[PDB]
Design a protein around this ligand. Structure first.
Ligand code: DGT
Ligand code: MN
Ligand code: MN
Ligand code: MN
Length: 430
DNA sequence: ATTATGACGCT
DNA sequence: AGCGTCAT
């Protein structure tokens, strides 16, 4: 009871840009705004592969991973924007630069953890204490939360969406103890006020809309973020967790959407996150290991301790290209030419990174996949990265992989290569 | 022939 | 260090 930790110490938000690459293209080209549209890589094979989809297009069933030709069968008026190609490969620079715009705005409110190109966690605990002491016990007006949903509300004893949002928010605010500066629910609420301000700043200063989740930890904030997209934010309180998890498929929780989640379902004979509460911590550890077991035991009760890392920049800078089917690289000239193309993009990005961020990478990781290998990476080898020179990097990568050539003929490459990947790692301040 | 990344855990 | 999993 009084010593049962409840995981309510922190206020954590997850901010995620709505259909990010689409918004980047819609900002640049107003003709794409408020339209079914998608962003594609390449074009020759089945119209290119879709990697981002506007919400208008999602209404037609268009999704990520779809080929554009198939998407056009669902949505004949779908508009398409193509990712830039440079040196023979997709080049994602426009979206990385747009991401930096957003991350820099978020960093004005709190230290952030860059979790992806379009999302960041925020630890708002200190900012919340600040704003609470500024409020002087003054209640929080619904006007300060104009895009906020309170998960689980309204409940208890009109048929529009905005109306239900306002009803739930009213019930939430009516329940609040705005005189207790240590009340977790109040702290979350103030956190949501701050996130409204952050999201308003992002849209004002970039044109981009985003969604967000506000809760007591990263997993709940991420889950919350997904509940009311697009262009809305959602507060998931500690108290909302039993009902929310009672019908939550295990796979919806970050890190459980793959083999581990499938094993939780199969071994324990359960379907929903809430069903995990009936197992002891030692039972879960016995099935899933010490770390996973302890994490599951806490997470199904709404408790997770993973910190928001102070890290706004990516830890690695990488360049990769698949060579599927009959485009696989089968000669030395071919392998060397593509290693050079990748290395030239890497050099350009690394040199910009060194100028912007006062650091240098010291390790080059070279990854390949050979034809017929089921795995995504067939071989991974490191070497020293001592100079930002593409010709040196591509020569070193070749030197590191050259013995994977089974061909006695040195001019040919067998088995042909179906992927090349160069990654710069182990940054040091400079 | 979902492609291009990027983080992190294991041993 | 190199490999595997998660993510999208
Ligand atoms: N190159 C590449 N980029 C991807 C891939 N999957 C996602 N992305 C990019 C494009 C997305 O706009 C961006 C952010 O992904 P999200 O999962 O946050 O989805 P998105 O923002 O598109 O929509 P959302 O509103 O968050 O559901 O990442 C991929 O498989 N390959
Ligand atoms: Mn997004
Ligand atoms: Mn995202
Ligand atoms: Mn997505």
């Amino acid at each position: 009871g009084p010593h049962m930790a409840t995981g309510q110490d922190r206020v954590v938000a997850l901010v995620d840009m709505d259909c990010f690459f689409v918004q980047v293209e819609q900002r640049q080209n107003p003709h794409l705004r408020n339209k079914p549209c998608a962003v594609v890589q390449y074009k020759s094979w089945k119209g290119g592969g879709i990697i981002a989809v506007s919400y208008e297009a999602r209404a037609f069933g268009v999704t990520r991973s779809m080929w554009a030709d198939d998407a056009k069968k669902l949505c004949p008026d779908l508009l398409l924007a193509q990712v830039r190609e440079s040196r023979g490969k997709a080049n994602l620079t426009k979206y990385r630069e747009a991401s930096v715009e957003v991350m820099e705005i978020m960093s004005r409110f709190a230290v952030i953890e860059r979790a992806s190109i379009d999302e960041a966690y925020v630890d708002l605990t200190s900012a919340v204490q600040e704003r609470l002491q500024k409020l002087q016990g003054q209640p929080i007006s619904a006007d300060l939360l104009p895009s906020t949903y309170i998960e689980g509300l309204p409940q208890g004893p009109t048929v529009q969406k905005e109306g239900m949002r306002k009803q739930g928010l009213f019930q939430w605010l009516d329940s609040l103890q705005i005189d207790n500066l240590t009340s977790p629910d109040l702290q979350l609420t103030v956190g949501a006020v701050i996130v409204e301000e952050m999201r308003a700043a992002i849209e004002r200063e970039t044109g981009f809309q985003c969604s967000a989740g506000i809760s007591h930890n990263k997993v709940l904030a991420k889950l919350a973020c997904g509940l009311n997209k697009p262009n809305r934010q959602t507060l998931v309180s500690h108290g909302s967790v039993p009902q929310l998890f009672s019908q939550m498929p295990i796979r919806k929780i970050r890190s459980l959407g793959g083999k581990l989640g499938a094993s939780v379902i199969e071994i324990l004979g359960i379907e929903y996150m809430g069903e995990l509460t009936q197992f002891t911590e030692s039972q879960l550890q016995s099935h899933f290991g010490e770390k996973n077991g302890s994490w599951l035991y806490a997470m199904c009760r709404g408790i997770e301790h993973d910190p928001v890392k102070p890290r706004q920049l990516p830890k690695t800078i990488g360049c990769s290209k698949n060579f599927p089917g009959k485009t696989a690289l089968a000669t030395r000239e071919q392998v060397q030419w593509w290693l050079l193309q990748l290395a030239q993009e890497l050099e350009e990005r690394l040199t910009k990174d060194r100028n912007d961020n006062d650091r240098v990478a010291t390790q080059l990781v070279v990854s390949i996949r050979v034809q017929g290998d089921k795995r995504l990476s067939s071989l991974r080898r490191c070497c020293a990265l001592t100079r930002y020179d593409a010709h040196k990097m591509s020569h070193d990568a070749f030197t590191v992989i050259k013995n994977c050539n089974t061909s006695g003929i040195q001019t040919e490459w067998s088995p042909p290569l179906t992927m090349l990947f160069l990654c710069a790692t182990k940054f040091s301040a400079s």
